[PDB]
Design a protein around this ligand. Structure first.
Ligand SMILES: O=P(O)(O)OC[C@H]1OC[C@@H](O)[C@@H](O)[C@@H]1O
Length: 772
C-alpha cells in the first residue's frame, strides 16, 4: 500500500472527491462521439461551423450527467471518472489498430469494453472513415514533408485530435454571464445576418444555458432524497445553476462554478489538451474579496476551491500509442499562472495567490498545473511559500520569468498591457490569455537528428572542414524549418476546415469584433509554435567533433562516423568513455560548448521567424520536449557526445544531457543564461532536480529562494524542480504498489511515476540530483 504523498488532516470532502477519481479503472468513452455523429448525420450541407455548434448543442443536451459524491460544483465531461473521450471525427483509424491492445499498452492504458468495441466498429468507424480531419491531412501533406517525417526529423501534432492549447478570456465570461453573450449574439446576428460564426456561438451559449438548467434540475431532484446536510448543499447548487444559466456571478463560489462550467463546455467543443486557465488568482480574487465582505466564510470558499482543483484532475485526454510516447502520462494542461505583474508594472500577488498554493498541499495531484510568475517585485513571503510548495516534491508549481517573457512578447508586437498579462498554456507555452491563438505545440523538431544526417552526409569528404559541417547543419535547418512550416500550416488548415471552435472563440479577443473564429485568425495574436529539441546533445556532439577531429586530429570525420555507425561497440568502447568524460559538456558554464548551443538555436529561431502561418501570424520557436525526448532519442543513432543509438535526448528542452552537469545547479543556470532566451516566445523548459534533504528547514527554503532570485536575474525563461531521492525512485520502480501516489515532474507537467513507462522513469532517475 501507498506511502507517497500521504495527506495529514486533509479536508474530508476534498479527500473523498480526490479518492473517488481513482476508485475505478479508466475506460474509453464513446458517448461524445455517438452524440457528435448523430448530430452530424442531420447537418450535411450546412456550414462547418454551424455543424460544429449543432453537434456541441446535441452533446450538451443529451450527455449523461451526475453530481458526484460531495461535490460543491456541478460539471464533469463524463460520469465515469477520467474517461478517454475518443474523437473519430479527428482520427478514426488509430483506435482500430489498437482496439485489442489499448487496455494493456505500455503507456496510458484505457479499457475499451466489449460492448463499446462493437459499437465503435458498427456505428462510428464506417461513418468517419474517409470523413475525418486526419483524412484531409494525409491528403494534403506534400512529398518532401512526408519524407522529412519518415526520416524522423520532425513530428506534426494534433493531426488526430482537437487543437486546444488556448486560454479563454475567463475575466470576460465572469463579468458578463451567459445571457449577456446570448443577447449580444442576437444583436450581432441581426446586424450581420450572413455571419455564420455569430449563429454558431449563439447556439452553443443557448445550450450552455440549458446545460446549467439540466444540472440545476438534477441538484433539486437529488436534494429530495439526500441527508439533512447534503440536501441544503444540493439546493444551494440548484439555485446557483439556475442563476448562472443566465446571470453574472456575484460570489467566489459562483465564479468558480461559472469558470468550471465554461471549461466543461469548452471541452465538449474541442476535446483537447491545454484549455488552460490563465491568471486565475487575478480574476477570482475580486470575487474572493467580495465574498469575505458579506461574511461568506473562508473555510467554505476553501472547500469550493478544492472541489475545483479536483475537477481539473477528472480530465485526461486519449491518444494513440505513438502519440503517448511524446506526451506520456496525461499532460492535461489546466495550467494556472499565479502572481506576476499588474497593468502598472507592480506586483500582482494578492491574498488568493497564497491560498491557491496552500490548498495544493492537500491536493498533491498533477492538476491544476500551478505556475508562479517570477520577477524582482515578488513578495518574499510569497516566494518562500512557492519554495515550500515545490518542496512537497510533486513538481508543482513551476516558474516563469517575467524578466524574459514580457520582453519576448513585446518583441512579437504584443502591446505592453497584454504582455504584462501573460500566462501559460499547457506545459511552458507562454501565451497572452484570452487574446492568442498560438498553435503552441504544433510540431516537434529534432535538432540532433539533423546533425546526425549532416555528419553521415559528409562522412566520405576527406577535405571536409569543421565550418563545412556547421554550414551544412545550418543549411539543413533552413531546409527543414521550411518543411515543418509547410506541414504545420496544413494541420492549421485542417482544424479550420474540420473543427472551428465557435464557443471558445467568443472568449478570445478579438473574434467577436472581427466576426471570425480563432481558426480563421480572429484572435488578436496568431502564432504557430515549433519546438527545437535536442540542443544540449547538439552542442555536446559538435564540441567533440570540433576538438576530437579538427583541433586534436585524434580521428577523421569518416573514422568518427564509422564509430557512430558501430554504436561505440567493440574496438570503440573506450572512445565512448573518451568523448563523454574528456570533453566539456553543456551545463557546466564552459563558454566553448555553451556558445555552440547559443549560436545554433539562435539560427533555428531566426529561421522560424521568417515564416508566416496561414492566419497572417508568425511562427515562433519553443525549446521544450514534454516526454518526446524519449521517442526523438530513439530516432537518432550514436552521436559524438557519447549517446548510444536510440538513447534519450536531453530532457525538458534547455536541460543538460542527463549526468553531464558536474559543477552543481548554479553552473547549469549560467550555461542556460547564455542562450538568447528572449527568442523562445513559445516557451522553453529547464528541469532541475534537488536532493530532498538539501531543501529541508528554514535554511533550505532560504537557499531555495536565493536560487530562484538568481534564476530570475539571469533571465532564464522557465525552471521547475523534482525533489525526490534516487532511492525513492528506484524503490518506486521495484515496488510500484507503495508509490501509487508519487508525482514526478516530466517536462512542464507532473505525472504519477508508476504510470510512466520505464524509459521516462529512467530519464528522471538519471537526471543529476543537485544540492544547494
Ligand atoms: O497532443 P496534445 O495534447 O494536443 O499536445 C501535446 C502537448 O503539448 C504541450 C502541452 O500543452 C501538453 O499539455 C500537450 O499534451
Amino acid at each position: 500500500k501507498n506511502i507517497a504523498n500521504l495527506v495529514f488532516n486533509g479536508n474530508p470532502r476534498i479527500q473523498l472527491m480526490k479518492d473517488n477519481l481513482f476508485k475505478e479503472e479508466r475506460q474509453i468513452s464513446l458517448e461524445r462521439a455517438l452524440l457528435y455523429t448523430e448530430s452530424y448525420q442531420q447537418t450535411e450541407g450546412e456550414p462547418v461551423i454551424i455543424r460544429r455548434a449543432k453537434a456541441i448543442q446535441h452533446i450538451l443536451e443529451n450527455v449523461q450527467i451526475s453530481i458526484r459524491e460531495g461535490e460543491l460544483l456541478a460539471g464533469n465531461r463524463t460520469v465515469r471518472p477520467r474517461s478517454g473521450i475518443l474523437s473519430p471525427e479527428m482520427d478514426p483509424y488509430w483506435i482500430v489498430k489498437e482496439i485489442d491492445t489499448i487496455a494493456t499498452r505500455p503507456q496510458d492504458q484505457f479499457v475499451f469494453t466489449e460492448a463499446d468495441k462493437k459499437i465503435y466498429m458498427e456505428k462510428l468507424y464506417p461513418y468517419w472513415e474517409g470523413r475525418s480531419m486526419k483524412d484531409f491531412i494525409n491528403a494534403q501533406l506534400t512529398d518532401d514533408v512526408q519524407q522529412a517525417m519518415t526520416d524522423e526529423v520532425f513530428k506534426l501534432n494534433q493531426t488526430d485530435k482537437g487543437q486546444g492549447h488556448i486560454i479563454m478570456d475567463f475575466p470576460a465570461i465572469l463579468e458578463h454571464g451567459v445571457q449577456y453573450y446570448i443577447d449580444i449574439l442576437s444583436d450581432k446576428i441581426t446586424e450581420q445576418p450572413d455571419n455564420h460564426f455569430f449563429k454558431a456561438g449563439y447556439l452553443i451559449c443557448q445550450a450552455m444555458k440549458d446545460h446549467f438548467i439540466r444540472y440545476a434540475d438534477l441538484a433539486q431532484e437529488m436534494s429530495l432524497t439526500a441527508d439533512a446536510c447534503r440536501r441544503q448543499e444540493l439546493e444551494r447548487i440548484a439555485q446557483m445553476c439556475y442563476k448562472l444559466s443566465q446571470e453574472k456571478p456575484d460570489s467566489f463560489y459562483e465564479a468558480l462554478q461559472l469558470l468550471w462550467m465554461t471549461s466543461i463546455v469548452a471541452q465538449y467543443e474541442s476535446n483537447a489538451s491545454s484549455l488552460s486557465l490563465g491568471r486565475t488568482d487575478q480574476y477570482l480574487y475580486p470575487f474572493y474579496k467580495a465574498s469575505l465582505e458579506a461574511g461568506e466564510s473562508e473555510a467554505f470558499m476553501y472547500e469550493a476551491l478544492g472541489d475545483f482543483y479536483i475537477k481539473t484532475n477528472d480530465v485526461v485526454l486519449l491518444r494513440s500509442q505513438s502519440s503517448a510516447k511524446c506526451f506520456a502520462g496525461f499532460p492535461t494542461g489546466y495550467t494556472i499562472a499565479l502572481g506576476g505583474l499588474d497593468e502598472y508594472g507592480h506586483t500582482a500577488v494578492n491574498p488568493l495567490s497564497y491560498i491557491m498554493l496552500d490548498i495544493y498541499h492537500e491536493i498533491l495531484l498533477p492538476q491544476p498545473n500551478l505556475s508562479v510568475r517570477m520577477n524582482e517585485l515578488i513578495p518574499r513571503r510569497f516566494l518562500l511559500k512557492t519554495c515550500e510548495t515545490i518542496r512537497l516534491g510533486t513538481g508543482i508549481p513551476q516558474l516563469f520569468n517575467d524578466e524574459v517573457c514580457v520582453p519576448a512578447f513585446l518583441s512579437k508586437g504584443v502591446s505592453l498591457d497584454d504582455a504584462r498579462d501573460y500566462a501559460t498554456v499547457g506545459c511552458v507555452e507562454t501565451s497572452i490569455p484570452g487574446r492568442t491563438y498560438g498553435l503552441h505545440d504544433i510540431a516537434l523538431f529534432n535538432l540532433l537528428r539533423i546533425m546526425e544526417l549532416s555528419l553521415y552526409d559528409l562522412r566520405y569528404q576527406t577535405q571536409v572542414t569543421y565550418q563545412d559541417i556547421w554550414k551544412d547543419i545550418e543549411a539543413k535547418i533552413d531546409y527543414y524549418v521550411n518543411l515543418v512550416v509547410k506541414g504545420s500550416n496544413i494541420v492549421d488548415l485542417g482544424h479550420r476546415h474540420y473543427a472551428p471552435t465557435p464557443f471558445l472563440s467568443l472568449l478570445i479577443a478579438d473574434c467577436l469584433k472581427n466576426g471570425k473564429d480563432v481558426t480563421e485568425g480572429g484572435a488578436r495574436y496568431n502564432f504557430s509554435g515549433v519546438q527545437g529539441i535536442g540542443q544540449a546533445n547538439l552542442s555536446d556532439s559538435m564540441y567533440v567533433v570540433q576538438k576530437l577531429v579538427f583541433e586534436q586530429h585524434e580521428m577523421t570525420l569518416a573514422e568518427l562516423v564509422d564509430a557512430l555507425e558501430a554504436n561505440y561497440e567493440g574496438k570503440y568502447v573506450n572512445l565512448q568513455k573518451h568523448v563523454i568524460q574528456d570533453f566539456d559538456k553543456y551545463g557546466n558554464d564552459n563558454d566553448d560548448v555553451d556558445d555552440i548551443a547559443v549560436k545554433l538555436f539562435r539560427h533555428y529561431a531566426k529561421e522560424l521567424e521568417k515564416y508566416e502561418n496561414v492566419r497572417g501570424g508568425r511562427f515562433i520557436p519553443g525549446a521544450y520536449t514534454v516526454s518526446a525526448h524519449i521517442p526523438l532519442g530513439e530516432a537518432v543513432g550514436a552521436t559524438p557526445d557519447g549517446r548510444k543509438a536510440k538513447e534519450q535526448l536531453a530532457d525538458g528542452g534547455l536541460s543538460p544531457m542527463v549526468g553531464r552537469d558536474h559543477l552543481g545547479p548554479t553552473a547549469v543556470l549560467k550555461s542556460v543564461s547564455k542562450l538568447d532566451n528572449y527568442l523562445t516566445v513559445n516557451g522553453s523548459l529547464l528541469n532541475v532536480k534537488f536532493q530532498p534533504n538539501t531543501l529541508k528547514g528554514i535554511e533550505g527554503l532560504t537557499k531555495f529562494a536565493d536560487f530562484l532570485m538568481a534564476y530570475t536575474k539571469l533571465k532564464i525563461q522557465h525552471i521547475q524542480f523534482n525533489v525526490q531521492s534516487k532511492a525513492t525512485l528506484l524503490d518506486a520502480q521495484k515496488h510500484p504498489e507503495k508509490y501509487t501516489g508519487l508525482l514526478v515532474r516530466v517536462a512542464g507537467y507532473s505525472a504519477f511515476f508508476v504510470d510512466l513507462n520505464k524509459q521516462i522513469q529512467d530519464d528522471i532517475i538519471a537526471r543529476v540530483e543537485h544540492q544547494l
